[PDB]
C-alpha cells in the first residue's frame, strides 16, 4: 500500500490529479489520494475490499478499464501459480446419438484475477464473464468467488 511500486515506472490510476491547494493538516491526514471505483451492474456488487484497499491494476473491472458484456459463465479453480491470473476448468458432458451414453470432457482456461480477492484457495467455485482480450490466452475476468459445495474450506460453525 505504502509501497506498490517495484517497476521502472510510476503506477497510478487514471482520472486522478494531485492538487496543491491549501496547506494545513497537522501531523497527517488525507493520504492525498481519493480512490476510484465503479459499478459493474448486472446484479454483481463491488467488494468493500476494493474501495478500502490500494492496488494499481488496469485489467480488473472494479478499478481499471475493461467491461463485462456478452456471456457470463462459471468454473472452478484448479491451479494458481501465476501472477495476477489463475487457471480454471470446465467439466461437462458430451453426448453421442449412435449410443445413448454420455462421456466426460474438460477444457482449461486462464482468466485474470484482481488483487482485490486474496482469499482464493484451490478448490473454490469461481464466476467469470466475457470481456475484450487482455492477453493471448486471457479473454475474461472474475466477477465473484464463492464456496457452496461439499467438503468446505473451514469447519462448520458459521
Amino acid at each position: 500500500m505504502a509501497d506498490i511500486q517495484t517497476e521502472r515506472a510510476y503506477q497510478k490510476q487514471p482520472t486522478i490529479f494531485q492538487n496543491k491547494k491549501r496547506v494545513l493538516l497537522g501531523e497527517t491526514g488525507k493520504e492525498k489520494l481519493p480512490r476510484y471505483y465503479k459499478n459493474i451492474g448486472l446484479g454483481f456488487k463491488t467488494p468493500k475490499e476494493a474501495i478500502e484497499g490500494t492496488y494499481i491494476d488496469k485489467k480488473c473491472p472494479f478499478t481499471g478499464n475493461v467491461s463485462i458484456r456478452g456471456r457470463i459463465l462459471s468454473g472452478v479453480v484448479t491451479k494458481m501459480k501465476m501472477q495476477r491470473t489463475i487457471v480454471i476448468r470446465r467439466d461437462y458432458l458430451h453426448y453421442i446419438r449412435k449410443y445413448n451414453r454420455f462421456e466426460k470432457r474438460h477444457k482449461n482456461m486462464s482468466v485474470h484475477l484482481s488483487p482485490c480477492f486474496r482469499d482464493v484457495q484451490i478448490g473454490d467455485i469461481v464466476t467469470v464473464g466475457e470481456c475484450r482480450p487482455l492477453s493471448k490466452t486471457v479473454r475474461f475476468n472474475v466477477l465473484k468467488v464463492t464456496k457452496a459445495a461439499g467438503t468446505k474450506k473451514q469447519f462448520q460453525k458459521f
Binding site: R8, Q18, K20
Partner: protein
C-alpha cells in the same frame, strides 16, 4: 512485408499450425518512427480507409501544462533524461510516450509573475529593479491591491518546484504518441511522481 500477423506463433500446447493464407494489407508493420529532437521534419502517410496519419521526426516543441493552476503554454523540449521502457533510447535521444524530458521553463514564470505578483527563485534582486519591476510594481489606483489580494495564499509554491526554476529547467512527462499524432504534448510532473523519478535518475546515472 514486415507484418503484424497472428497466423504465425504457437498455440498453448506447443503445437504448430501449417501455413494458411498469404499476407494481407490489413496486417502490416511499416518501420518505427524513431523520432529525435531537432528541426521539424514531418511526413504524411496514407493509411487504411483514408484519413492520413502524421509521423513526426525531430520535433522540438510540445505543449506542456501546469494543471495545478491551469495554464498551458508552448515551450521548447531540450533533452531526454529518463525513458522507462529502455536505457538505450536515452543514449540516442529518442522521444516516445511517457518519457521524462527537460524544458525552458520560461512562460510559466511570466504567467506566475503577472498573475500572482511575485518572482520565483532569483540570483539577485539587482536585475529586477530597472526593468521586470515595471510589471511587478504597478500604477493602478484601484486594483494594485484589489485584484492581487485574492491571489494571496494560493501561491505557496512547493519546494521541489521552486528550486528547479533557478536551473532554468523542469521535468515534464510526454503524454502523446509523436509518431502517430505528429505532435508532442504532455503534462509537467508534480507530487509523488516528481519525487519518484528524481530517485531513479540519481540511481541510474552518476
Amino acid at each position: 512485408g514486415i507484418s503484424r500477423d497472428n497466423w504465425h506463433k504457437r498455440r498453448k500446447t506447443g503445437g504448430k499450425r501449417k501455413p494458411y493464407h498469404k499476407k494481407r494489407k490489413y496486417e502490416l508493420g511499416r518501420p518505427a518512427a524513431n523520432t529525435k529532437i531537432g528541426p521539424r521534419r514531418i511526413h504524411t502517410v496514407g493509411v487504411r480507409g483514408g484519413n492520413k496519419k502524421y509521423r513526426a521526426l525531430r520535433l522540438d516543441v510540445g505543449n506542456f501544462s501546469w494543471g495545478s493552476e491551469c495554464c498551458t503554454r508552448k515551450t521548447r523540449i531540450i533533452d531526454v533524461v529518463y525513458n522507462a521502457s529502455n536505457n538505450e533510447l536515452v543514449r540516442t535521444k529518442t522521444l516516445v510516450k511517457n518519457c521524462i524530458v527537460l524544458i525552458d521553463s520560461t512562460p510559466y514564470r511570466q504567467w506566475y509573475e503577472s498573475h500572482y505578483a511575485l518572482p520565483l527563485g532569483r540570483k539577485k534582486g539587482a536585475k529586477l529593479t530597472p526593468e521586470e519591476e515595471e510589471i511587478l510594481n504597478k500604477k493602478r489606483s484601484k486594483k494594485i491591491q484589489k485584484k492581487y489580494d485574492e491571489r494571496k495564499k494560493n501561491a505557496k509554491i512547493s519546494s521541489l518546484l521552486e528550486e528547479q526554476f533557478q536551473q532554468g529547467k523542469l521535468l515534464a512527462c510526454i503524454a502523446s504518441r509523436p509518431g502517430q499524432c505528429g505532435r508532442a504534448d504532455g503534462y509537467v510532473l508534480e507530487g509523488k511522481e516528481l519525487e519518484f523519478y528524481l530517485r531513479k535518475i540519481k540511481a541510474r546515472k552518476g
